Every structure is written in structure tokens, then in C-alpha cells.
Design a binder for this molecule. Structure first.
Ligand SMILES: CCN1CCN(Cc2ccc(Nc3ncc(F)c(-c4cc(F)c5nc(C)n(C(C)C)c5c4)n3)nc2)CC1
Length: 345
């Protein structure tokens, strides 16, 4: 039995062959990534003499349709970013090849997990975190351009790639999960560790959900470890609550899924639910002040007396993160204002 004249496996994926040449132009090197959508391969573009990443979408209508939306968002961004100055990997071109949609990007070689793994998950410096944070806030600034109003919806270390000159810069990839404000209203979205309270609570959401993800990611960049590593949605919300306390009553009163996590008392206040069975630190007592080590030399005490890691520096970082982790999406800090924060001065 053959699929797509022998080009596909039994799962609608193009059968990648190291060394194959596509259209006398792309010399396929190796598989670099894979997922439900298809595959990403490393290839050498002989015409432009440069390494590229090619995202090969499955020969399957559902994934083709998803990726056609992705292409339209990338092309929209290209129309607003002729200088490629916003830390988003640029779509160079797209084409159909043997019944697969192919998106071609400049080739980057590492993600943020790779960088953290090289620190043995001890985290990078506050100085490097500051540079990456400014770059990510600049990307979010661009996405909130009114005509764009793009919600990435899947910010996580795997979708943040490193630029080849090392410690210079990161760039965002994977807009296959993204939508525009008021175009898709899917409810179980974001990667769980980076999932905002509004999404957990089943409430309406906007571009502020990406700023929540970014706050979580920035803490993880500096500490080496995920801030909120929930094994399921209840564990996820409970780990958020350990750090930030019970969400405001005016939010829980409007939340479809409030009762998945909390119970309203006759007093009108909200508490965590309890179970006949896990055990959590009391609400708000796992202080970000101590996660970051503001007064104790940073994470693990490893930054004691290091330039750019003074108590004053840590207090500005802590303040920015808490502004990104505001429970209220209407008052959570927005990209332009984050970029004006004293942490970046
Ligand atoms: C077990 C981990 N293995 C080995 C380590 N490896 C890290 C890694 C990841 C990516 C690259 N290279 C690269 N360069 C430019 C690009 F634009 C994309 C790109 C574009 C897209 F549109 C994507 N859409 C999705 C879903 N992905 C995912 C693959 C992130 C996209 C990636 N990728 N190099 C290394 C991961 C796999």
C-alpha cells in the first residue's frame, strides 16, 4: 500500500529523505522537529546559499487549512515589518510541493530550553534575562498593532529560538496556534505551564494572555525552572494561587469555571476547594520575592555580589513580573508600558 504516490507515510506526513533535493533548490539535511501539523526540516537553499528551516504540513485538509491561516498571518506581519526588527522569525516564502504546503524560514538552531539545559537549569543572568525580556516585549508590542491584534497563544520555551551569535537575541516562531482578536474563540488554549488564569477560568481573553505567558517564561529564564508546573488544570491553578493568592472576587464572580477550583462561602468570599484525598502552601505564601532571591543573592544564592544583580535590580524585576502576572487582564501591564519600566533603564 502506498500513500500520495509513495511520497507520504500512513500518517499524511511527507517521508523525509536525507539528501533529497526539492525543485533543484532545497537540499534536505535532516528532521529538526515534528508534531501533529507535520514536520520541520533543516535544508540548504542552493539558490540563496543559506540554511533554511522548512515546515512541511501534512497532506490532510484539517492541517492544511490551519497552516493557510498561519501563512496569512505571517504575510500580514511581513506587510507591517519591512525591516524585520521585531524579534519574530520571518516567513521567507511558501509553496505547495507534492501536495504538502511548505513554509520556508531562516534557520535557527536552538530553543530556550537548550540554553537553560546548558546552565544545568540554573538560569541565565539577570542581565541576559533583561535583554531577552526587552526583545519579547518588543515582539508583543508589534503583535498588538491594532490592524494585527495577533494573539500568539502558544508562548513557551520551545517557541522561542536563539539567534546564532550567542547571547545576542531570541526570536519567536510558530504562529500556527495564533489568532486575531475576535476571529477565533477557542477555549482550551495555551501550553499548560504558561496558561493564563482567564483561560483556566473559561473566561473571554485578549492579547493580555501572551503577557501572562511571558511573565512566567521570564522567571523561568532566570531561575532555570518553570514557575507554575501544573500536572493538570487544578494543580496549575493551585500552583498559581500559592504564589499570587486567591483571584479577586470580581473575577471569580464572572468565571464559568470558578467552581472547578474554588468554593464561594456564605460571607461572599472565595476559598480554594478541598478534596477527600494534594497539599499546597497557603495562598500567597510562596513569595515571588523568595523565588527570585531578591534579598538572598538571587536563585540559589548564586548571584550574590554579581553586577546587575543588586537588591535594587531584583526589586525592579520582581515588580515587572508582578505586573505581568496581574490576575486582571484589563490592568495587566501592556507591551508599550512594559518597555518603559525601570527594569529596562
Ligand atoms: C527534541 C527537540 N528536538 C531537537 C531540538 N529542537 C530545537 C529546535 C527547534 C527549531 C529549530 N529551527 C528553526 N528555525 C527557524 C524556524 F522558523 C523554526 C520553526 C518554524 C515554525 F513555523 C515552527 N512551528 C513549530 C511547531 N515549530 C516547532 C519545531 C518549534 C517551528 C519551528 N525552527 N531548531 C531547533 C526541537 C526538536
Amino acid at each position: 500500500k502506498v500513500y500520495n504516490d509513495g511520497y507520504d507515510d500512513d500518517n499524511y506526513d511527507y517521508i523525509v529523505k536525507n539528501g533529497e533535493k526539492w525543485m533543484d533548490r532545497y537540499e534536505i539535511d535532516s528532521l529538526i522537529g515534528k508534531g501533529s501539523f507535520g514536520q520541520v526540516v533543516k535544508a540548504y537553499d542552493r539558490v540563496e546559499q543559506e540554511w533554511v528551516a522548512i515546515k512541511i504540513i501534512k497532506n490532510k485538509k484539517a492541517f492544511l487549512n490551519q497552516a493557510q491561516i498561519e501563512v496569512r498571518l505571517l504575510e500580514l506581519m511581513n506587510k507591517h515589518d519591512t525591516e524585520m526588527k521585531y524579534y519574530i522569525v520571518h516567513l521567507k516564502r511558501h509553496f505547495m510541493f507534492r501536495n504538502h504546503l511548505c513554509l520556508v524560514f531562516e534557520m535557527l538552531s536552538y530553543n530556550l530550553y537548550d540554553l537553560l539545559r546548558n546552565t544545568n537549569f540554573r538560569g541565565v543572568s539577570l542581565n541576559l534575562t533583561r535583554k531577552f525580556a526587552q526583545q519579547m516585549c518588543t515582539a508583543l508590542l508589534f503583535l498588538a498593532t491594532p490592524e494585527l491584534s495577533i494573539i500568539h497563544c502558544d508562548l513557551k520555551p520551545e517557541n522561542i529560538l536563539l539567534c546564532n551569535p550567542k547571547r545576542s537575541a531570541i526570536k519567536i516562531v510558530d504562529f500556527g496556534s495564533s489568532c486575531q482578536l475576535g476571529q477565533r474563540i477557542y477555549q482550551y488554549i495555551q501550553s499548560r505551564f504558561y496558561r493564563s488564569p482567564e483561560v483556566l477560568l473559561g473566561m473571554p481573553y485578549d492579547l493580555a494572555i501572551d503577557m501572562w505567558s511571558l511573565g512566567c517564561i521570564l522567571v523561568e529564564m532566570h531561575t532555570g525552572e518553570p514557575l507554575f508546573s501544573g500536572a493538570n488544570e487544578v494543580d496549575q491553578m493551585n500552583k498559581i494561587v500559592e504564589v499570587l493568592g486567591i483571584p479577586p472576587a470580581h473575577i471569580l464572580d464572572q468565571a464559568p469555571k470558578a467552581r472547578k477550583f474554588f468554593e464561594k462561602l456564605p460571607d461572599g468570599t472565595w476559598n480554594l476547594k478541598k478534596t477527600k484525598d494534594r497539599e499546597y502552601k497557603p495562598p500567597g505564601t510562596r513569595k515571588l520575592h523568595n523565588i527570585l532571591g531578591v534579598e538572598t543573592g538571587g536563585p540559589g544564592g548564586r548571584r550574590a555580589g554579581e553586577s546587575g544583580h543588586t537588591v535594587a535590580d531584583y526589586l525592579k524585576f520582581k515588580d515587572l513580573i508582578l505586573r505581568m502576572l496581574d490576575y486582571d487582564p484589563k490592568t495587566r501591564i501592556q507591551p508599550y508600558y512594559a518597555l518603559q519600566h525601570s527594569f529596562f533603564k
